[PDB]
Amino acid sequence: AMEGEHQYLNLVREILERGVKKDDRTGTGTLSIFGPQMRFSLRDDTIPVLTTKKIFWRGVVEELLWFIRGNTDAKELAKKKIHIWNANGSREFLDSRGLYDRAEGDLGPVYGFQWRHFGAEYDTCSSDYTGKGIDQLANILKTLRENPDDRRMIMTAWNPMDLHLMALPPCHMTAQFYVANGELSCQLYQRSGDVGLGVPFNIASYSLLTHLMASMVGLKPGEFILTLGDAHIYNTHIEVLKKQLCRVPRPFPKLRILMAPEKIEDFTIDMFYLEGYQPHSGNLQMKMAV
Amino acid sequence: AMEGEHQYLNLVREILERGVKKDDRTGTGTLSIFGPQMRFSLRDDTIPVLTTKKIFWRGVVEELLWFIRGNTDAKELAKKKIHIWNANGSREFLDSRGLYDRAEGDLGPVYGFQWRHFGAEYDTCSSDYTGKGIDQLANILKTLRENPDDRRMIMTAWNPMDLHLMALPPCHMTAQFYVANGELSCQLYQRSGDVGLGVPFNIASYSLLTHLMASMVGLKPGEFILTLGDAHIYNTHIEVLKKQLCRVPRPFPKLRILMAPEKIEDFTIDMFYLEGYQPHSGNLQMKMAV
Ligand SMILES: Cc1nc(=O)c2cc(CN(C)c3ccc(C(=O)N[C@@H](CCC(=O)O)C(=O)O)s3)ccc2[nH]1
Ligand SMILES: Cc1nc(=O)c2cc(CN(C)c3ccc(C(=O)N[C@@H](CCC(=O)O)C(=O)O)s3)ccc2[nH]1
């Protein structure tokens, strides 16, 4: 009752029991702890997609491919009926950030823009950024092939100069990669984690990324480590999360990668699938705080 | 046998027992694990300066104040008989990084330069950077006073655009601050930790920083959390660390702050002292791998 999905359930219990009350930015209110870490094995093809609640896997995949492409237009996700970024791209939300000149859906130089184009000057979400900025992700993949013992395989979205241009500052903010005994591991530093809503999705996302990167460079996936800053439960999620805690985890699913492309941004959903995913049938709704 | 200094001693043991053989940049060789976390209480004025090995406290203090001032000239530490940065500022080391125009001792836009002037253009270590770049540390102090529940109190030295100008990329790279029940906590993400040499010094440094910041903003110190990426023991340190593991820890010392100045960069060593530090007397030499 300590490994795998129990890492997440034990974190929920810890926050409910010893989390402190916080009047947060959204006005919803939270219970919070600082600095918890969870670790998930990616061996034997395992990927930690929660079974005690059905995770929006199609959204995980498409958001991740959108990040990997460096894209920042929420409308591209919305065309696929993935609406997870629409609220932070709305006219109202953008105006509240002082971003009056931004088109609706244009989140600014967020997440994957920093991963692929760190330091590039942002124009709009539809601009061509090919060859602009520092491609941290491509550089990591090269280092993994050529010098896997390197201790500097860092991918960050925390760019102080660009925060004011982003709809929200990055939650999952800096990742490091590591190789030992033919296995690729990833540690994510996440400054802020909505434990009921974003965190399960973010775990699935970076675990997927680690599997995809490993297949590009001839390694096997090792471990995904999530280290949180402010790990919080929104007051509106407490009752539903108590319900989730009564559920017994089932074995995690496996990822089957059918092929790997030449460049990571060419991965498409047809190149891999989730095998053996058996989430509990009762859907749990966690209203997004805004 | 788990709290306080045992956090560090148990990490040493863990690396010795299950660390994997990993070659490294210096050619010395290491045993390595990825992702370990250590937590230290700063309550009751405690500061986690190791007692199983004498730590160079005066060096910790002067290095930190140098960082806080945004300074980057190793020659200024050497004038104070603190030589810890001399090797990475040498002509030979700078030339090996391609930094041919850099004067000896000028480490570039490292650590505190990023903390106080993120994004500013670097000239030399003697240039005046007042008002240039983003003062992340000052911003954090303001936020702690005005909106302590904020989830963005981040101070980073990881600037992809400036890495090539640095004598070494930052080891201790990104810190986050947090407030609960009138206590200030700090979590440091450290991508690379030399467990025998740098890590004890880095623990003392960021714990001191947390004490000093709390005194600037009317809070009490809470916890210091160190989260490592590549946590490693150099092969040359194994025997001395095994000797250290035989020493019984004594209670950690206490930090006594005598006054707080108006701005954090005005702190001097006369404004605080270490009470009751009783380290084991037999000096343990961990040669720096270069
Ligand atoms: C307050 C806040 N918390 C979040 O976790 C968050 C997440 C995103 C983006 N993101 C990473 C996600 C948003 C929504 C997700 C999701 O998994 N939604 C599911 C379940 C929704 C529900 O249970 O009510 C879905 O739409 O199926 S995942 C944007 C702003 C945020 N804001
Ligand atoms: C390989 C490497 N490991 C490090 O830990 C490291 C640290 C620094 C800067 N730094 C943070 C420090 C360097 C030396 C320290 C120190 O505590 N020295 C003590 C003990 C020396 C010894 O026992 O051999 C001293 O000089 O008194 S603390 C620079 C390059 C590095 N390079």
Ligand SMILES: *c1cc(=O)[nH]c(=O)n1[C@H]1C[C@H](O)[C@@H](COP(=O)(O)O)O1
């Ligand atoms: C942000 C986006 C993501 O992918 N994951 C997340 O959990 N979140 C959450 C954290 C927090 O609840 C909120 C961001 O608000 P803030 O910037 O921390 O105030 O979204």
Ligand SMILES: *c1cc(=O)[nH]c(=O)n1[C@H]1C[C@H](O)[C@@H](COP(=O)(O)O)O1
């Ligand atoms: C860097 C400086 C510091 O304050 N603390 C550290 O522990 N180190 C160590 C980590 C590593 O052994 C070496 C830096 O080498 P690399 O850039 O990780 O290859 O110094």
